[PDB]
Design a binder for these strands. Structure first.
Lengths: 97, 106, 95, 82, 97, 109, 80, 98
DNA sequence: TCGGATGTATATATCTGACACGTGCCTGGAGACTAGGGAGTAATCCCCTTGGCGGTTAAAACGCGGGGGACAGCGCGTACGTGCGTTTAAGCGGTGCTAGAGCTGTCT
DNA sequence: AGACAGCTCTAGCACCGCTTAAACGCACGTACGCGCTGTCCCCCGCGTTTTAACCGCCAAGGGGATTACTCCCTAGTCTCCAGGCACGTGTCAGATATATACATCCGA
């Protein structure tokens, strides 16, 4: 049947996910991850639904911003594919490493 | 007759609250009477600029209610509010629609 | 006290003056309330720096005017200083 | 006991974030790289948030704890209180 | 006229230097940097201690506010050692005459 | 009058507890400042001072020098993983930078 | 005036060399001057602003330290 | 044939020299005149403390040095040795300066 | 080329629970007055900053050769995108509980 | 502002059933990483030139720091009352559902 060529659905997805603000990570898996990490610092912690949302909003914004910076340095290397070294470079240039 | 300091200054923002907050925020042991009037005027001005750009974005999007998307679009589109709020993340704001020319088809 | 302090009324009134036909969502309203609180802390914070750097024990229009010029960009600063000086002018002259 | 929940962040979820970020093509290596980055980011933000929670001697992580943590790290979040 | 006194941690940086390296000296430029560092760290810990007191609507900055500011500002092992040193100092200060 | 003894000596500290206590009250960091705050803060400041001075003195001895100079302070701060993170946003005058060359830059045949 | 061009090409090279750069394209110099010009403008404008608030006519070292402190980078070694 | 060091061999040595030393690399007079030239645009007849010009030079040189490091990192990332203007712009953009 | 697939934006109608309006009321804003010391004003000084001359001599500018590294063009292969059927548990609604957030009062 | 006792009653955690979209494993193609090659330009290294940064010494004057004096401006306390803030309410905006245009891309 009809098939979209590579990159067509990616551009469409970029437009769709940029035109939309909803959270892209599943709420329940992220909530479990937050709890798993939080238990390392202090056990039996409880998280307000607003607190988990705050972490997800920040995490999605942080990663989206990081992917923007990563995309910029990927284009600089004359690549469209982002590589782990691109994330590592951006994080080092950003000063967070 | 008692008339609010906000109306005297020609401002909507609560000069009394701004004065209260400055007195309670321990920014100094004393706060001059002109400080909250000046501060309230700046806060009201920035609020008007933000809402004006947000309302224009809402109208462009044929919406009549400002939602976080419009605030984010306004803040990031204005070359000076973006710089002021460069370290700020707006919940449910998303990002500016932008794809680099190199990524677009030939 | 349980009382909650927020700029809901003031943001709405300014919105009515800027766009009477336009409303604002409770989510966008909470953002604006946090934005006002954040900018207020920045200007008050910088104003505290200026007072302390000059060992002054009070915050006056000069500290605010300077803090605004430091924190706000060029055009925002010029307009904010204009609005601030105008508001203080009317406030002082109107008695 | 919660364990290995980092794999709960599906590859399509990382793809969607990258798509919102304008990424056109994502190397298969990015998925594990992104989880490690997010794991560090969440550890830093949660460590600060839990620190505020512990200082308040609370057992529930309040939304303000996350906002203050994000503020301290220069990534203040608007929309969850003043 | 006579020049006014300008207070600095010079004598304290030197006394601590004599403890870590009795034979080693320190130039005026390095002393100025150490004084700048002490005042910078002081303002940062005190600045975070203010935020903590304010967030909890407290009017008094206590050891708990300082300890929390230290844990937040200082990295992991530095925080652990600093907390131990601060705890030893405060405990011995309170128990001593 | 009772025997006068400094607060620092009681805490087993060299750093000035009185100066820290006064600076906290004079900086208006809070409406009130507890007696434990300057003791805890002075101990942290003293420990961090010893931490840097020790690493700086080691760097000085490693450089065969008798005095710690800005260079030794920069090397000590940037060589320690945690001090480098604590002072990442800090610039030290006359300190220079760590001797650093990337493997791709080194000479080849 | 020419004072922007007054920061010699070898001086830029020395900074690049201290920064670990092994080879420098001929266009880095003009770009580096612009980058420095905007950096100095942001720091001087704040220092001048701190000076004006003090009603002083000379920019002290503290005025520059506070300008940097606000610019987000702290400078050690000048007191205060 | 006169003995000549191969391209980059002296650069590799210069890097060690300048990284080993800590003196300021911009001449005090050109920098001092540049500071006053820019300051003249904000307020006329300004004066600068001797140490104030030094503070501006220390920060300016440390900033450019730190910028060149980040610039070199992104130049190496592009599989290049020579740093170009787009490398500076990229480093400044990723550093959050624009 | 090119026409057909076929997702996203838009237009239509219904809906609905969100926010905009209406209300009660009390506590936080405004008004009045004081104390008082912080802040402004004035005179003074002096020092360090700005300005100048001399000169020399380190550093910068300029010219040149060439080689090495930036980058155009190329091949390819394997990794990643996309499509499909599978199936999985997140999302949704409902029910349970009680930890512990939030508050008051003491109170000390 | 926390030790202690107690109340609320919120809402976070605990749990099941059902839905079905999101996640998943796998098929499979050609888009795209990059290794390899060619090349030329433009950047390095040095001789050579020169200029202006640098040192050192002196002028001077002005503005910064200082002391002396003052008072007018703000914090504290008191008075007051209607502005703003939980509650009540409903209606109409854009979510949701449905239909259908059109722009954008693919197989021919």
């Amino acid at each position: 049947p009809h098939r979209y060529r590579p990159g067509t659905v990616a551009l469409r997805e970029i437009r769709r996910y940029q035109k939309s603000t909803e959270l892209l990570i599943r709420k329940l898996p992220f909530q479990r991850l937050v709890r798993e990490i939080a238990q390392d610092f202090k056990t039996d912690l409880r998280f307000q639904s607003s607190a988990v949302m705050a972490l997800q909003e920040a995490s999605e914004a942080y990663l989206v911003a990081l992917f923007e910076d990563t995309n910029l340095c990927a284009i600089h290397a004359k690549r469209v594919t982002i590589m782990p070294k691109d994330i590592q470079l951006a994080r080092r240039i950003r000063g967070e490493r | 007759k008692a008339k609010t300091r906000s109306s005297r200054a020609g401002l909507q923002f609560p000069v009394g609250r701004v004065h209260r907050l400055l007195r309670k925020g321990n920014y100094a042991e004393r706060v001059g009477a002109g400080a909250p009037v000046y501060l309230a005027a700046v806060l009201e001005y920035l609020t008007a600029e933000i809402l004006e750009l947000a309302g224009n974005a809402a109208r462009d999007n044929k919406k009549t209610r400002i939602i976080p998307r419009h605030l984010q679009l306004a803040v990031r589109n204005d070359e000076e509010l973006n710089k002021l709020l460069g370290r700020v993340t707006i919940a449910q704001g998303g990002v500016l629609p932008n794809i680099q020319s190199v990524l677009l088809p030939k | 006290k349980s009382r909650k302090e927020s700029y809901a009324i003031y943001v709405y009134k300014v919105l009515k003056q800027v766009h009477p036909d336009t409303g604002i969502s409770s989510k966008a309203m909470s953002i604006m309330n946090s934005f006002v609180n954040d900018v207020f802390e920045r200007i008050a914070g910088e104003a505290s720096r200026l007072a302390h750097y000059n060992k002054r024990s009070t915050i006056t229009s000069r500290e605010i005017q300077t803090a605004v010029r430091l924190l706000l960009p060029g055009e925002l600063a010029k307009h904010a200083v204009s609005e601030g000086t105008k508001a203080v002018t009317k406030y002082t002259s109107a008695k | 006991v919660l364990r290995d929940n980092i794999q709960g962040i599906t590859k399509p979820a990382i793809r969607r974030l990258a798509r919102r970020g304008g990424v056109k093509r994502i190397s298969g290596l990015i998925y594990e790289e992104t989880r490690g980055v997010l794991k560090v980011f969440l550890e830093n933000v949660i460590r600060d948030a839990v620190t505020y929670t512990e200082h308040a001697k609370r057992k529930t992580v309040t939304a303000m704890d996350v906002v203050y943590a994000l503020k301290r790290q220069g990534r203040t979040l608007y929309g969850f209180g003043g």
